[PDB]
Design a protein around this nucleic acid. Structure first.
Lengths: 193, 193, 193, 193, 193
DNA sequence: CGCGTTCGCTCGCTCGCTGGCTCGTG
DNA sequence: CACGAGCCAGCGAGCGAGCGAACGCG
């Protein structure tokens, strides 16, 4: 069946405070990117911090891209951009197929190095553990959950906490940016158990 | 010989008054469960609050199940559902075999938490001490009685006070739901003493 | 709100009687450190055992530093160096934020070991429980108090019992080394309750 | 001031009648121990049951030893070995300093258990209440007297009722084994009141 | 002094029940091995399940051998093959000398993996916990007893419960397969304590 | 005395740490 | 290749609810 690893990445929303030394082309880029809610959505765009989302998106892209290089395939995934009490963080779920838990982290450290070079122009974000692999516990091994995790902990999130979502997993392509669709699946899930 | 611990559980009846926040699936469940008196019984089914019994049963089940997980065995028992002045409460008698009096609670309480998650969908019953271990007194030890306790204090009970009973203890499998069989053993007991 | 843990450290005053084997560089260090009362103070510097205070401070510094490594933040605190019938002892109050009662102990332990290697050049102080966490009672939970604990039990102290104080908590920055400012807050406290 | 607790222990003087099961090494030990009266004494060593005294001494040693483990200090004391109408019994007076009135029991109970293991080789003396804490009354609270209690009730005792005594309390170190010294202080006491 | 760890191993004495998939060469091996009681023995060989003992021995050998690889020495030991109500199980005691309680399990496991490959030709015995280490208590450290444990709990055993014994520990080389030598040391032990 | 309140001791559960493998990269 | 970062099962001090004798006032 489908099993996934979870890698949480914090979004360094502030230029100088998080990325001291970054050029302007960066600050202009994050700005010169306007987000638009697709037809089937129903989210309040006013509650979607666009500047951050623009960064989180790039992150996600490079991540998945660089990841598929290892998995040697089109890894089914489900990214959810969240905004919490501390800071923004991308909840990413990729399918294990192709990456043995014994070597996941040797690869994430390859992607992390890449995010920096591409997204942040070789600048190390001054954020503590901005790319952490979800373990079963401290010193435990890579967690690994099944599809069920999405509607169980990810879907129930609602703005402003919820910001955006992505996913090539058909079963949730609509639940991505639609609080209604979600509420449905989220209910269904709590039922069949 | 056979020794038993006694754990009294108050069975909640008013979904709102006792379990505020509970969904509907629960209220529908307790309802969609009809009780029928087995052939050898002789009780007035009209005096058996089925809605509560439905809950008391589930409690009983999960309690025993979770309990055998500790006793590492098929613990002999005898549960009696009673209805009193204050509220309904399951008189449970499990054999000590395997549970030291010093660590009774830690396990008992491990169960309580379970009942909540399973039976009441993570909702803490607003009832004072709905799961109390019977103490020989104040600051006393966990009271532990022998088989004789059943016919001595449990069997004598008659409707409406008595609502139902369970037991894998052959010696009383018929006295469970039969006021006649009970009156017999109850008398016998009073005799051989 | 702000909640704090309390870690009492007995400061080993007598070099040879408490730290047998310690070099001279240590004894010289504690001596070559002259303390001076800040302008806003009003303490009798004559009653402030500088040699011990020099050590208590080092202790304090390392403690806090190492502590923030755990809390992953600038933990609000309030340390008060006291001198009693038995021996000097730093009353430390750090905010719980970050350290779950369960693990508090394995954290202070690492610190303790750190204090030895850094402050006492790996020499184990021959003092009974020189670093002890406050419990709400033998076998009880790690006592966690709120800001109020400070003016309630710490501020009322006056020389010679009081020796010094530290704190990044603005509300008491002046009460630290000012018996007058103290008496003020100490009074206000006893009133508003 | 100096306050004391009183624990009366019944020294098992009949190897078989009181300690059934004890080995021989014990009976040989008590025998191979000859008592001698120190220079300042004046007691008739002929009236001093050596065999019992040998056990009473061991008892007293272990008692005080184990006790100091609790009081965390050198507890001032005054043990008097007496011989009554029923049996020999050590009158022990230790200073409360360190042992609250709500826990004296649990601490003595531990000592008792220790005396058995060390002194009597895990053999429970068949003597009713051989280790009783002196109370104010039956059902009362743990009694506690001051230094005055020694010359008031303990010193007056004279052979054969008086067998021996001990005490790290200077004021009575001579009155211990000297009927003369005692009679003096005993006199002085009755006067200054 | 001599301290030992205790590793209990069951004995998968069933080709079709415990080792499904095993070849015949194995079943023929355990059979083509006839045990004989040494001269100094006195055991009833009729009560010695030879087929199991043949496996238990191989287990023991590989174990010890592999173990000395870690200990970097000739580890003093004492293995006792026992037959219980559930199944056969080798009581093994190896001297800690060289294996820090921290890596015990990590090593034993390497041994377990070796037993499988060598003794059972890569077939995982379908027995629950067939190679368990004994700990003081849950959450406690690995149990480490001294020489005395042998006569204290191991020697008393008598057929059919006792099946055999090994040991390079001179002091018990004879008590190994002699119920008489055992009874002596077993007695002596109970005395000198 | 009976009976309710202390409060030292018990002992399963938690969760960061140890330290021998594993396996891709330079 | 060997390293050496990432891995993680095994570990066990620390914890804190519970338990129950000891106690001692009404």
């Amino acid at each position: 069946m489908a099993t996934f690893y979870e890698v949480i990445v914090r979004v360094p929303f502030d230029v100088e405070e998080h990325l001291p030394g970054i050029s302007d082309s960066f600050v202009d880029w994050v700005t010169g990117q306007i987000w638009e809610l697709p037809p089937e959505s129903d989210l309040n765009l006013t509650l979607v911090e666009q500047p951050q989302l623009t960064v989180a998106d790039r992150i996600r892209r490079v991540f998945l891209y660089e990841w598929n290089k290892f998995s040697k395939q089109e890894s089914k995934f489900f990214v959810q951009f969240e905004k919490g009490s501390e800071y923004f963080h991308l909840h990413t779920l990729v399918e294990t197929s192709g990456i043995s838990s014994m070597v996941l982290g040797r690869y994430v450290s390859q992607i992390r190095a890449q995010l920096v070079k591409v997204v942040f122009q070789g600048i190390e974000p001054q954020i503590n553990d901005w790319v952490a692999i979800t373990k079963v516990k401290k010193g435990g091994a890579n967690k690994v959950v099944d599809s069920g995790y999405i509607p169980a902990y990810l879907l129930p999130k609602v703005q402003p906490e919820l910001q955006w979502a992505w996913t090539n997993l058909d079963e949730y392509k609509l639940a991505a940016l639609n609080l209604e669709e979600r509420k449905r699946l989220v209910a269904q899930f709590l039922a069949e158990s």
